[PDB]
């Protein structure tokens with residue numbers, strides 16, 4: 300936000316009057332720049348976690364497991380998976396605020412790069428499990444990887460080698476069900492939509508505050524200058540500057556609080572990516588409900604989506620133990 | 622030794638602490654410098670206002686100066702509170718790392734350094750801590766043909782712990798994180814059902830360690 | 838709205854060199870010469886106000902940097918997936934940041950890669966613990 304232009308509209312007298320208030324504009328500009336740098340850093344930590352850009356094999360034969368809904372689709376112009384495209388479409392004017400020195404700035408990493416990072420992570424976890432998350436990537440059949448993961452949760456690997464077909468069918472059915480639920484539910488992405496709405500509302504209130512007289516005869520600086528002499532125009536412009544500066548300070552404080560909250564959320568998301576996507580987590584209810592098996596990352600506008608695959612007991616029978 | 626160099630060669634190694642100190646110093650400098658602003662008054666010195674102007678308008682001048690200085694103080698205090706909250710979050714993270722990484726071995730991935738964490742060493746620094754994470758990282762990898770199970774007498778055999786590998790013709794069982802081939806036997810493998818259900822099973826012979834003693 | 842926007846200076850370490858590039862945020866390169874009025878010191882500012890090496894990025898218009906089709910690790914973040922560096926006659930260049938190096942795991946349904954050696958890796962993690970207790 301341009302403090303000088305926002306408070307004073309191309310008015311030399313207004314700028315001269317504001318110059319006597321100190322260096323609040325510099326403080327606000329520094330705070331906004333720090334917030335932007337923090338957002339970029341949060342995105343980098345959340346997504347830029349793998350150096351090598353792994354690619355899936357041309358032939359996708361993973362022992363019956365289907366990853367079409369999560370792997371990128373080269374057919375579409377954008378190399379994103381079906382779920383990623385659905386998430387992008389389901390989330391939806393800010394440029395209409397480019398009228399009072401309110402720049403929107405470009406994100407450092409384009410959506411294409413985020414999609415590429417997600418695809419690389421998916422390929423690394425599918426073709427190398429958690430080995431690539433600790434050092435050199437080591438290939439392993441997906442069946443043996445799932446056997447390892449089952450062994451991690453205290454279940455003998457023979458169960459997978461005996462019910463691989465059933466497990467693959469259940470995995471495909473669950474992928475289809477989650478895709479359908481995301482498609483048919485508009486409230487699934489409530490957090491990102493709420494954040495966007497809050498930011499838009501804050502910006503709208505900030506821009507609308509310029510129409511308040513703040514005790515002055517008029518809300519237009521030019522009208523005050525034309526309709527009053529310097530002795531009274533000075534005090535009128537001073538009152539307007541005070542009101543606009545108070546509004547800007549309130550907006551900047553709210554933005555700082557929101558940025559801190561988003562930084563905490565991004566740190567949590569990065570921790571979850573590190574502990575779930577790149578490996579198996581024994582923490583209860585951390586990487587989804589039930590005995591965590593693995594996770595799939597996907598990118599959504601200014602956010603991440605983790606599909607946690609977990610093992611849950613289904614049928615139990617009574618027994619006598621000693 | 623390399624760690625020492627990593628601190629001596631790189632000037633921005635301690636960027637976080639230096640940045641925090643610089644931010645605090647800049648905030649304090651701006652706060653102290655704000656006292657030189659008139660805030661709409663004739664002068665920014667209380668003595669000048671008192672001597673030059675009589676109490677009637679000196680009252681409003683002092684009121685304007687007080688309002689400006691109070692606004693500056695409130696802004697500075699809000700910024701300090703936000704920074705203190707951020708530093709408290711950082712300190713909580715550091716304390717958690719010390720409790721988990723240093724006082725024990727953590728299975729969390731990428732939490733205590735990169736790779737398979739082994740042990741963390743703490744060090745102090747001005748208004749900060751430095752954790753030296755020592756971890757185990759695979760270096761050289763070799764690829765071998767593998768099977769999910771092995772059939773010997775119509776019964777599927779699965780490794781007790783490890784993985785089946787094949788250096789071409791022969792077959793062995795080796796630990797996952799290190800190549801230590803071993804002769805396949807009943808001690809390191811267990812039977813579970815027949816060998817007509819597992820997909821990709823490979824025929825082989827399981828060496829029973831009891832036979833040499835029985836023969837002798 | 839007529840135009841407006843910010844002006845930023847991209848400069849490497851003064852120890853390396855002194856030449857700099859000028860970025861005008863969210864403005865077409867056509868209006869840059871009149872957007873600054875060209876009423877500055879005869880060399881330098883006019884040199885950075887126009888020239889052959891003018892690039893039109895989504896983040897704005899950049900002058901004084903040579904566009905290169907190559908991709909390297911981001912050094913000076915410009916925006917919209919574009920960065921700038923001083924890599925060459927050394928000058929300032931602008932490129933698109935590369936998200937690491939390409940790799941392809943030789944995945945197979947009957948092959949497994951096992952380590953044959955190991956390494957002890959020591960890394961450093963610095964965390965602030967407190968600040969000055971100013972009163």
Ligand SMILES: *[C@@H]1O[C@H](CO[C@@H]2O[C@@H](C)[C@@H](O[C@@H]3O[C@H](CO)[C@H](O)[C@H](O)[C@H]3O[C@@H]3O[C@@H](C)[C@@H](O)[C@@H](O)[C@@H]3O)[C@@H](O)[C@@H]2O)[C@@H](O[C@@H]2O[C@H](CO)[C@@H](O[C@@H]3O[C@H](CO)[C@@H](O)[C@H](O)[C@@H]3O)[C@H](O)[C@H]2NC(C)=O)[C@H](O)[C@H]1NC(C)=O
Nearest residue numbers: 454458589590610611612613614615616617618619620621
């Ligand atoms: C597992 O058990 C729980 C606990 O209740 C059960 O109630 C009966 C069925 C018990 O039956 C015993 O089962 C043992 C082996 O599992 C044992 O070996 C015997 O076979 C049997 O008892 C023995 O045989 C019988 C023929 C007789 O001779 C007895 O004297 C012998 O000792 C046993 O499984 C267990 O206690 C089930 O959950 C529910 O638990 C309720 C009590 O907490 C029980 O009682 C009520 O049932 C009414 C029925 O309408 C309910 O409305 C009420 O709320 C309450 O539940 C329930 O019958 C029982 N079952 C259900 C469906 O509510 C549980 O169902 C059962 N199975 C599984 C898979 O968990």
Ligand SMILES: *[C@@H]1O[C@H](CO)[C@@H](O[C@@H]2O[C@H](CO)[C@@H](O[C@@H]3O[C@H](CO[C@H]4O[C@H](CO)[C@@H](O)[C@H](O)[C@@H]4O)[C@@H](O)[C@H](O[C@H]4O[C@H](CO)[C@@H](O)[C@H](O)[C@@H]4O)[C@@H]3O)[C@H](O)[C@H]2NC(C)=O)[C@H](O)[C@H]1NC(C)=O
Nearest residue numbers: 359360361363364365366367368369374381471474475478
């Ligand atoms: C891994 O999973 C993927 C996706 O689930 C499979 O790819 C296809 O997925 C769709 C899901 O139903 C199927 O193919 C599509 O079928 C649509 C109609 O359903 C019937 O179509 C086929 C062919 O007519 C019937 O034989 C069969 O009974 C299906 O029930 C078609 O309309 C699709 O064509 C285009 O239009 C639709 C319109 O909605 C689009 O959504 C589609 O994406 C597509 O652009 C499409 O043909 C089928 O299940 C899967 N195979 C094929 C060949 O389509 C993979 O097969 C599965 N396994 C892997 C990848 O190994």
Ligand SMILES: *[C@@H]1O[C@H](CO)[C@@H](O[C@@H]2O[C@H](CO)[C@@H](O[C@@H]3O[C@H](CO[C@H]4O[C@H](CO)[C@@H](O)[C@H](O)[C@@H]4O)[C@@H](O)[C@H](O[C@H]4O[C@H](CO)[C@@H](O)[C@H](O)[C@@H]4O)[C@@H]3O)[C@H](O)[C@H]2NC(C)=O)[C@H](O)[C@H]1NC(C)=O
Nearest residue numbers: 462463464465466467468469470471472473612613614615
């Ligand atoms: C552990 O739990 C799993 C499930 O979680 C069990 O596996 C399921 O078993 C049930 C019953 O055996 C399966 O349901 C049945 O599938 C039959 C196969 O039909 C195929 O085509 C339909 C088309 O819609 C598919 O939906 C279906 O998955 C199959 O691909 C159906 O024919 C059955 O319907 C009819 O079956 C008989 C005839 O055989 C009729 O008499 C019945 O009245 C009924 O109308 C039925 O739907 C289910 O598909 C299995 N799961 C999966 C993923 O395949 C394990 O058995 C269970 N194990 C233990 C030890 O308990």
Ligand SMILES: *[C@@H]1O[C@H](CO)[C@@H](O[C@@H]2O[C@H](CO)[C@@H](O[C@@H]3O[C@H](CO[C@H]4O[C@H](CO)[C@@H](O)[C@H](O)[C@@H]4O)[C@@H](O)[C@H](O[C@H]4O[C@H](CO)[C@@H](O)[C@H](O)[C@@H]4O)[C@@H]3O)[C@H](O)[C@H]2NC(C)=O)[C@H](O)[C@H]1NC(C)=O
Nearest residue numbers: 765786787788789790791792793794801802803804805828
């Ligand atoms: C995949 O991996 C397998 C297993 O390692 C390899 O097969 C073995 O290869 C080694 C080395 O090439 C062979 O070692 C040999 O040992 C002989 C003595 O072993 C006695 O017992 C075997 C039966 O196990 C008899 O066949 C043999 O005749 C002996 O009676 C040595 O005589 C051989 O030559 C020299 O080495 C030994 C080492 O101690 C010396 O003491 C000898 O005096 C002699 O100078 C040789 O070392 C081993 O026999 C092979 N088989 C087995 C079962 O281990 C495959 O070659 C490998 N394949 C690939 C493609 O890498």
Ligand SMILES: *[C@@H]1O[C@H](CO)[C@@H](O[C@@H]2O[C@H](CO)[C@@H](O[C@@H]3O[C@H](CO)[C@@H](O)[C@H](O)[C@@H]3O)[C@H](O)[C@H]2NC(C)=O)[C@H](O[C@@H]2O[C@@H](C)[C@@H](O)[C@@H](O)[C@@H]2O)[C@H]1NC(C)=O
Nearest residue numbers: 438762763764765766789941942943944945947948949950
């Ligand atoms: C064990 O792994 C090595 C490599 O990790 C296999 O050798 C071959 O290395 C290539 C190096 O990148 C792999 O990619 C290839 O890259 C070249 C460009 O440099 C491409 O032209 C080529 O098409 C590949 O994409 C390659 O996948 C990999 N495997 C090959 C080429 O088969 C090694 O394979 C072994 O050697 C080759 C020459 C064949 O004889 C294989 O049958 C043989 O297994 C891997 N070995 C095993 C047993 O898994």
Ligand SMILES: *[C@@H]1O[C@H](CO)[C@@H](O[C@@H]2O[C@H](CO)[C@@H](O[C@@H]3O[C@H](CO)[C@@H](O)[C@H](O)[C@@H]3O)[C@H](O)[C@H]2NC(C)=O)[C@H](O)[C@H]1NC(C)=O
Nearest residue numbers: 358360362440767768769819820821822823945946947948
């Ligand atoms: C891993 O992938 C390979 C292929 O890359 C699979 O090899 C395939 O194995 C099947 C079953 O043995 C072969 O089916 C064929 O059927 C005919 C008719 O019944 C039979 O005469 C053949 O001997 C063969 O069994 C298939 O041809 C073969 N494919 C290739 C390209 O060789 C393998 O099964 C997969 N799984 C494992 C554990 O290796």
Ligand SMILES: *[C@@H]1O[C@H](CO)[C@@H](O[C@@H]2O[C@H](CO)[C@@H](O[C@@H]3O[C@H](CO)[C@@H](O)[C@H](O)[C@@H]3O)[C@H](O)[C@H]2NC(C)=O)[C@H](O)[C@H]1NC(C)=O
Nearest residue numbers: 768771772773774775776816817820821822823824825826
């Ligand atoms: C691993 O070893 C088992 C047993 O040693 C092999 O099973 C053998 O499979 C073949 C067919 O692939 C059988 O041949 C046919 O069997 C039927 C049913 O018994 C019989 O009616 C036919 O006349 C014919 O003999 C064979 O009997 C069966 N058993 C043995 C001992 O050979 C299995 O094929 C082996 N796997 C591999 C990959 O070599």
Ligand SMILES: *[C@@H]1O[C@H](CO)[C@@H](O[C@@H]2O[C@H](CO)[C@@H](O[C@@H]3O[C@H](CO)[C@@H](O)[C@H](O)[C@@H]3O)[C@H](O)[C@H]2NC(C)=O)[C@H](O)[C@H]1NC(C)=O
Nearest residue numbers: 758759760761762763799800801952953954955956957958
């Ligand atoms: C696993 O890796 C370690 C090193 O990470 C290997 O040990 C190292 O092997 C190299 C090569 O032989 C040694 O370098 C040699 O040093 C001697 C002087 O001692 C020099 O004269 C040679 O020209 C050569 O440079 C190195 O000293 C040795 N140790 C270390 C700590 O690096 C080990 O051999 C590897 N294991 C396998 C099975 O490959």
Ligand SMILES: *[C@@H]1O[C@H](CO)[C@@H](O)[C@H](O)[C@H]1NC(C)=O
Nearest residue numbers: 632633849850851852853854
């Ligand atoms: C640059 O050179 C000067 C003097 O040689 C000195 O500041 C230092 O050695 C170099 N680095 C920086 C940051 O100034």
Ligand SMILES: *[C@@H]1O[C@H](CO)[C@@H](O)[C@H](O)[C@H]1NC(C)=O
Nearest residue numbers: 864865866867868893894895
């Ligand atoms: C201005 O730049 C945009 C690209 O951001 C381009 O589409 C448009 O044609 C340009 N207009 C002129 C007049 O150069």
Ligand SMILES: *[C@@H]1O[C@H](CO)[C@@H](O)[C@H](O)[C@H]1NC(C)=O
Nearest residue numbers: 903904905906907908930931
């Ligand atoms: C970059 O590629 C474009 C084609 O898209 C080509 O016109 C241009 O000359 C290339 N520039 C360089 C420096 O290679």
